[PDB]
């Protein structure tokens, strides 16, 4: 039962930044394996006995402890050094992973550019309607996004969804879908998506008439 | 020398049981104990257990004792794991790892397995071309869209113009709208690129031999 703290949780870092990460058991351990984990896909061996790189991984990183602390560095932050690390336990067991540390990578802000789009005739059809706003390319996550009907607020039928931090360019999108009835959309004219951002001191908001 | 082989998703009724292989495929199958480790959507790893092929020995994690059972074929080097009376905490990505000597490090890891415990049944998806309303997009010329309501089994494919076109592309992450799911996908083209053009959407769920087309037609 020996449990694996990992700190920090969470972190980002702008490239060119050292970078530690730890990882301290409830008892001593032998050596500690690392892992490395992109969003999708399966975890890669990344340093095994606490200091030897696995195969590929670059210079830039490197681990040590003893007893119950261990850690892993790096010595300057890069755009493909962003993912989830686990440190590994397996000198006792059962065999405990750590709790996780999520790297980030940080970059220059950058504002969303937002889209609204009306319910489609084919779904109207059927009798039901759906809204649709699109917050993209936005950096600092912490967005937040309201809907208003003919000028009142609505928190209600509404569905968010987030994308990772995009690879090439380091942003983030965001999804708004707002479903009624074909009789509550009629039974009203206005429809607002509205964005509230650090990178404005003031709403940004997007809407059309029915 | 590495090269590991899952199964497809799985998708068991609570109460069920699924029976899921990994086969080895490039090295001294009975030479390696086998790991199989369990992460639950937008969480951590935690170890089940191990098999040795070649005696068929055997440790296992104990809060997985009545629920899981290790075995393999030798003679096609794979090894299995079936686990029992499934439940919603059963749900999630299952992987097989090949151990080494000495330091004991879990060198090549499966493309990993994913399980679904419910009660559901697979429904098809509605594909809905959103089309823009005149300046109610900004910059980036213009941005289209494509809404896939209401189907069950995750598993969907989405593209644009059989995938001529993927670049300035963003498929959202599925949400579930009690027992169902719903996905969007963006497109942003230049000006002189969309009526003159032609921009399609192409979705495709797996679970119900569905493959709709829709073509983005303006207002």
């Known amino acids: 039962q020996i449990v694996l703290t990992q700190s920090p949780a969470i972190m980002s870092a702008f490239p060119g930044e050292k970078v530690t990460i730890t990882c301290s058991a409830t008892?001593?351990?032998?050596?500690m394996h690392w892992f490395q984990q992109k969003p999708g896909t399966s975890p890669k061996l990344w340093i095994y006995?606490?200091?030897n790189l696995a195969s590929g991984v670059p210079a830039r990183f490197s681990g040590s402890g003893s007893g119950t602390s261990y850690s892993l560095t790096i010595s300057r932050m890069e755009a493909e050094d962003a993912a989830t690390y686990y440190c590994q336990q397996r000198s006792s067991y059962p065999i405990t992973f750590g709790s996780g540390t999520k790297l980030e990578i940080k970059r220059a802000d950058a504002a969303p550019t937002v889209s609204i789009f009306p319910p489609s005739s084919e779904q109207l059809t059927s009798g039901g309607a759906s809204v649709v706003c699109f917050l993209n390319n936005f950096y600092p996550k912490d967005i937040n996004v309201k809907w208003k009907i003919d000028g009142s607020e609505r928190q209600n039928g509404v569905l968010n969804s987030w994308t990772d931090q995009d690879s090439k360019d380091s942003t983030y999108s965001m999804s708004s879908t707002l479903t009624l009835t074909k009789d509550e959309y009629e039974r009203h004219n206005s429809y607002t998506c509205e964005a509230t951002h650090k990178t404005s001191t003031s709403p940004i908001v997007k809407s059309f008439n029915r | 020398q590495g090269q590991l082989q899952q199964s497809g998703a799985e998708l068991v009724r609570p109460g069920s049981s699924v029976k899921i292989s990994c086969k080895a495929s490039?090295?001294?199958?009975?030479?390696?104990?086998v790991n199989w480790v369990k992460q639950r959507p937008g969480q951590g790893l935690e170890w089940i257990g191990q098999?040795?092929?070649?005696?068929?020995?055997?440790k296992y994690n104990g809060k997985f004792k009545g629920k899981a059972t290790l075995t393999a074929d030798k003679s096609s080097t794979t090894a299995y794991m079936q686990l029992y009376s499934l439940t919603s905490e059963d749900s999630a990505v299952y992987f097989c790892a090949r151990s080494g000597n000495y330091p004991y490090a879990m060198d090549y890891w499966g493309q990993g397995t994913s399980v679904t415990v419910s009660s559901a049944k697979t429904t098809a998806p509605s594909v809905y071309p959103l089309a823009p309303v005149c300046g109610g997009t900004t910059g980036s010329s213009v941005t289209l869209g494509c809404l896939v309501k209401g189907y069950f089994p995750e598993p969907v494919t989405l593209t644009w113009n059989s995938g001529s076109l993927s670049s300035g592309v963003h498929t959202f992450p599925a949400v579930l709208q009690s027992g169902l799911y719903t996905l969007s996908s963006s497109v942003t083209v230049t000006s002189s690129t969309w009526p003159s053009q032609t921009i399609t959407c192409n979705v495709a769920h797996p679970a119900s031999s569905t493959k709709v087309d829709k073509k983005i037609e303006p207002r």
């Open positions: 098999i040795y092929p070649g005696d068929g020995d055997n």
């Open positions: 490039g090295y001294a199958f009975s030479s390696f104990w």
């Open positions: 008892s001593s351990v032998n050596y």
């Open positions: 006995s606490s200091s």
